[PDB]
Amino acid sequence: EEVETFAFQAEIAQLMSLIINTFYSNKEIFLRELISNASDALDKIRYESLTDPSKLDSGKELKIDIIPNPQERTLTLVDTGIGMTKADLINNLGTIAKSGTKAFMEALQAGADISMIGQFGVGFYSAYLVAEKVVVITKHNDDEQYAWESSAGGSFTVRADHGEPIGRGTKVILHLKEDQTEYLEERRVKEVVKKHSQFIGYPITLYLEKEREKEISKKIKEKYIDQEELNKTKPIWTRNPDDITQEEYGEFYKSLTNDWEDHLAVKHFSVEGQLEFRALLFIPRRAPFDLFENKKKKNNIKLYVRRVFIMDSCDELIPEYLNFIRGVVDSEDLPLNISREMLQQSKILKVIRKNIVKKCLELFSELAEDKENYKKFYEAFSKNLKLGIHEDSTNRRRLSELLRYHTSQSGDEMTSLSEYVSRMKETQKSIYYITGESKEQVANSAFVERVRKRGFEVVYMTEPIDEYCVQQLKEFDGKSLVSVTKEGLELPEDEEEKKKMEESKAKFENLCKLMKEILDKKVEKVTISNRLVSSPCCIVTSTYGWTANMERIMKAQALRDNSTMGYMMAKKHLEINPDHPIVETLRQKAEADKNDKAVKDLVVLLFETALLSSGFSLEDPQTHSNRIYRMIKLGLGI
Amino acid sequence: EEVETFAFQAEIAQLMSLIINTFYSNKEIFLRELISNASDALDKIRYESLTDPSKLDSGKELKIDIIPNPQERTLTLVDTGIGMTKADLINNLGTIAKSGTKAFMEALQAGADISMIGQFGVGFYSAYLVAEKVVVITKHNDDEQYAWESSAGGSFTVRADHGEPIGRGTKVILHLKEDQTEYLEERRVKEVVKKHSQFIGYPITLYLEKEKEKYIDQEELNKTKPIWTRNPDDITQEEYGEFYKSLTNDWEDHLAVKHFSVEGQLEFRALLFIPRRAPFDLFENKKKKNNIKLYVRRVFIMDSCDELIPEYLNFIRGVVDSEDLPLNISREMLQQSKILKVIRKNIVKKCLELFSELAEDKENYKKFYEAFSKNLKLGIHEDSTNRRRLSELLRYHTSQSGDEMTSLSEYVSRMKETQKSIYYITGESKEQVANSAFVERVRKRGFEVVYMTEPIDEYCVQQLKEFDGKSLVSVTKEGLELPEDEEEKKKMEESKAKFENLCKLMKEILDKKVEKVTISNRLVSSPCCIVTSTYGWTANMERIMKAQALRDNSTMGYMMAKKHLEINPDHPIVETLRQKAEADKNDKAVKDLVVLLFETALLSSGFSLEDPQTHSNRIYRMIKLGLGID
Amino acid sequence: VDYSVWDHIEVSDDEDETHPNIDTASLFRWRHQARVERMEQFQKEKEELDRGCRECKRKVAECQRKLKELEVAEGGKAELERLQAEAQQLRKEERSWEQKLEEMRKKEKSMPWNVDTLSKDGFSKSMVNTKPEKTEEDSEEVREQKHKTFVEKYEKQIKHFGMLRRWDDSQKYLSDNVHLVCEETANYLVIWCIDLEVEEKCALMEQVAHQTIVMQFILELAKSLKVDPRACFRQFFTKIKTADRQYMEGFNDELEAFK
Amino acid sequence: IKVTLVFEHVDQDLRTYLDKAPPPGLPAETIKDLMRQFLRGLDFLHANCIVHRDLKPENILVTSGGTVKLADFGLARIYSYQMALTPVVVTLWYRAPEVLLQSTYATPVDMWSVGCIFAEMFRRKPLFCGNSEADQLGKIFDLIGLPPEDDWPRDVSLPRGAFPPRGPRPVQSVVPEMEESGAQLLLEMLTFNPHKRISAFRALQHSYL
Ligand SMILES: Nc1ncnc2c1ncn2[C@@H]1O[C@H](COP(=O)(O)OP(=O)(O)OP(=O)(O)O)[C@@H](O)[C@H]1O
């Protein structure tokens, strides 16, 4: 039928209560939004005075002052900005979803460098979260002084000049609620503004009753506090990186976080793409005691919008393994929601993260040139590197180049795997390494004896994260990594010596068979290996399962008792050193009498000591020591 | 005069764009909001029919029909509610922050069992997050059928509809944006349905063009029904089981269930469930903590168990359905998170009660404990306020037990009249600690020890300082107190003098290997043994802590407990050594033996061996001597 | 439009209000104690104010009775006047006790919300799922109904499993479709392989046969473990994914035999 | 394989720290940090009105990272298990005069307690050591000075005025490595009159720290 046309309506009486009551959960945004508005007015002046200096004839100084009045339970915000006209108080201030910042967005075609903060035309009314009533006394240069007045009760009023000199900007009177007196406290005020007005271009001061000595001068101290200090920390990333030096940049770091020492490593990140933003990355000289305390919320990389603290979700801004880099991300192109407490379209941060990580890797690469400070960096955050390698498979291409180890040839000097590789022999087609509990353990292990005899370099690994990294890093610079702890350690060697080993296998064939029977259900396979030199034998890990170190780590560290995995992972073999005097003797003893229990017991003893030398825990160490005590008694004639 | 009065204004042109851009983050919620409104209207009918059943003449069925239309790229939602009059369309539907739900609720002030939501009066406009244009066609029982058309462009139009008749209620036509066609996907729709509408009281159906490709009425779309809303006394185990299995999707039913409701400023009903088996990803650090979900009026709000429950209770499945919470304008977020903490506290209390009653059921408790004792022990470690309660649930194997675990109180009931402490021993295995020299004298003195074989027991026992007024003591540490017969005490002092110089010699031999050398009656069958100082890590703790990938090794300067060599003066070896000291304290072979014995003791006592190669090399040397090799 | 009623909630164990130099393991307990002591002091105050009010109330009530008596008394009106003044003072005292009680009411209005004031235990009902009575059903009878309808009901889901190859996909799949972890499923897969042979779909047949033995494997050791296959099927994936190659091959031979 | 973490609780009691600490002259800079760690903790505790006049050396945790953590806030929530039979009778060289005067808990009370503890840290040995509460004051007074019954608080159970006046003994010279600035902070904390003492905040913000 006849189509009737209607305009959309709005129940302002309900809407206003929704604005105040349902739009925000954190009442700290009270001061944030009030300050933001003041800074917008100051931006309005900057522009007008920029193009026309006479705009400052009624005041040049641009700042935001806050004066609490506990005797009234009120707060005063002094906005020295351009202010509002009577019409603006009625039209802009008194209208929901109405903002004069939009007028400047459109008007400022020349003012491309004038960036207003926010644009909803609603945030003003969040003042009533804690205030019972708000009065806005203002005098824009194009009008007289008026006093806007409302308690957010469905209406507002505007009064004529009352004689209290406001020739510029506005005086905002914040009548606080009976239960909001905490905002009259110096501490509380500071807590809020430090988290929200941290990088306001214009200085914010507080006028506080100064704690002082009784005015009996005999002694007396100053009556009031001028807290300009709130904005002592300025934006750094906003300046040209080439013109930013450490004399100020290092000061920023020490101000960024309470650390009275210059940073270790840093990286400016300037993005001119769709997601325009700049960011400063900071690496501490020392890792924090809470570095791995994942129970605590992250806050190293913070997200600012138009130099206003918005988010600090490092969970999205960075990857877990980079949770040591502290910094500031500042964008003016982000789609924050109506509360401004959360960024809409998190896919934005996904892109931002990726881009930041790229620069993190570039920083690490830059650091690698500075061997001295790199070593310091590496040592401070080597676990994070190794965690990154373990987790972030995509960037192992770069993270694995940052690895540094002590080897059998570098010894006490920690060297790069790329240096290892560049110094490999023409037969050394794989990276030889050994993991364990400590350096002197693996450096004196039977596993690396022949390896050294073959002139091969062994990478010494001792951390559990090293044990984890070798489960992820398989090849480096095109060459595979080979643990000397596993069966099948194919060292490059003379074929004729291999023939000698085969003849030795025949020689000790029956010995191996006997030992296998002796160690039935103790070892999966008894065999011969020339990886051994000084030892008569050695328990080795298989090509599958957990290593002795890995078992140690997993079985003790894991909170989950995965006996199924442990069962499948618990694999090991026994290697024999055919050149060892004992082994030689054992063969002779087997030939003399394979049923000689004393020999069999000796084999068991050697097995248990082989387990010990290879890091395998004994199933009953007490009985091992008992044998020792028995042997001792025999030696003592007991 | 000197003051002018103005009403507050609202720039709808801006406001509207804020509503459909900044007020919301997620956009798939448009289904939730429209469905919620539909169910409100279905409740409106119900209430009205309670007073006049003939109001059901224009259709006697209460449901929500979802009919996607890919050929148009639109979505038709049929709400079989009362409907809206032209006046309601132009007054309520086309008005910001306004809803007749409130007015209906005012009518409900006369007494009703009706429960609706819609205190904001804006949810309709969330449709424009996804849809380019929305058309609402309706037929109120007291008015004609009208078509309400708008793209949220500052205006809307209304005309009487023609063609297909609506008995009652309203149809919503979502002219979906070109990049919003993913909402035409079955999966995507069902995703959102399962996300927020899984407990809608009214039938919601999904029509899909399937075999013959015709709209098939998926009536089971939200067949899941609320259980906590029902009287628990009238709910059977089979019903609780089926709910659990539906809740968790676990073919196996629950171990236990408990209904819990509170009344007052905080008001809710809830079901808590204990699973029979633990999940394979129970400990996964990145696992979403959503075991118990939070609803308001059966509307899914959030499932943040990170704050709802303790981490050590992060296995209990359930639903908490509140009656009135301070939700933000975005319902997805709840204001005043302290409320959740209050809820948590009350839940914890009830979980503990359920655990206690579960403990009464010994057989099922054993099953429970076996699966979740790690969480119990975690609670001992993490929770300083309920530890005592949690400690009542602890069960261990002990010397007088078999493979049956026993409570700490049961241990206490078997303590001697002179026993002031609970003896225990930690380790890797029960057999290991059962064969320890440290529990031999303890057994000889008639005492029971508690066997602690998990690595987490080092964290648990750290908090178990006193239980039922009884102290706790490790047999592996120095200062182990067992009944001392004055006669024996004198004999031990005589023995101390007897082996005094021997111990001094041993210390000279192992000055940097052992902190103190002394005899002790804690030993029975062993010549010697290494003990841990009361300050610092135990052999077990040390070993375990040194298996941690992310540990800080520099902290060990504060945790490296002193090692002491206990000597058992009753052995021929020890006696021989004394005699050998008398013969020649500088006898190298004797000194070597002392070193051997120490490493032997150190190793067998569970302490790290400094050099297994050298240790075994000594052994190889001794073997060669036995073999006559060299 | 007004959630201010919940703006004053006190939580003694609020972990979001802590400090680096403070051990909250004891602080939270301090908060508890303080909260309790406060309430005790409050209650004592209120009771004493109520007592005082009632005492003055009774005193003035009795004085008022006496005022009536003094009025009646022949010349007792001299005493009446005196007593009236005293009664007024008693009323003023009563009043002031009530004013103090009004202040107590104001204090209650200002009182923080907590587990003791926000709500009460509206309903509590536990239940331990012990039973469902030591029993047993004839699985052949069950299959007579189940194999015929279950298999068809989830035929596509059985086939879906049969079309998997990645161990992760198979495990996750059965996690989602755990009802398929049974003999009826495996039996279908065997039959399906036979049908695939007939249809010349050998490539698929082999993959289905692979998944057949996976389900048979689950059944194999579920029977060995004396447990419901659905309660332990993930352990088979755990075993397969962790088993040493040589042992895995041995297990596969045992498995093929089990099928 | 899934990943999960578990963390160890720090049992490094201040007393243990002191037992591990070196001879009189404990690095003032280390103490300065521990002092401001303690005082920062106090500001929080004062902000939360935490009452704990019973806080003693052993209720102070010094972590492996040098962090002071405070625990055991007053008898009302402590010693729920086996405790001392002379928790009070023991020499109360670490308890404020206000404790010895049988008054109450306050910012100055708390700081007086730890003030002596800080001196103990410097000395690796209790600052004062008396018998009764009056005798304990008789040792306290030797360092901070003593006046007659004209600088005593109202809440006094001890025979005020029966404490023969005496001078102070420059805390700077008495306590090992006590830099004058800290000597003044300490003397302020040690001062008999609780209102002549310095608050946790004021001391915390003092350039000494
Ligand atoms: N202190 C102030 N000085 C000048 N104008 C102000 C002040 N406070 C509010 N206003 C008026 O309010 C308008 C917008 O303020 P409001 O904060 O409500 O919206 P916004 O700041 O643009 O974005 P948001 O609504 O998110 O804060 C400004 O354009 C200005 O007209």
Ligand SMILES: Nc1ncnc2c1ncn2[C@@H]1O[C@H](COP(=O)(O)OP(=O)(O)OP(=O)(O)O)[C@@H](O)[C@H]1O
């Ligand atoms: N199925 C329906 N039958 C009849 N009226 C309806 C139906 N769905 C919506 N309405 C009308 O739509 C109007 C707009 O309300 P809307 O749903 O946007 O607010 P609300 O959703 O109730 O509040 P909230 O934003 O909190 O959900 C209501 O006045 C209601 O009468």
Ligand SMILES: [Mg+2]
């Ligand atoms: Mg603003």
Ligand SMILES: [Mg+2]
């Ligand atoms: Mg609605």
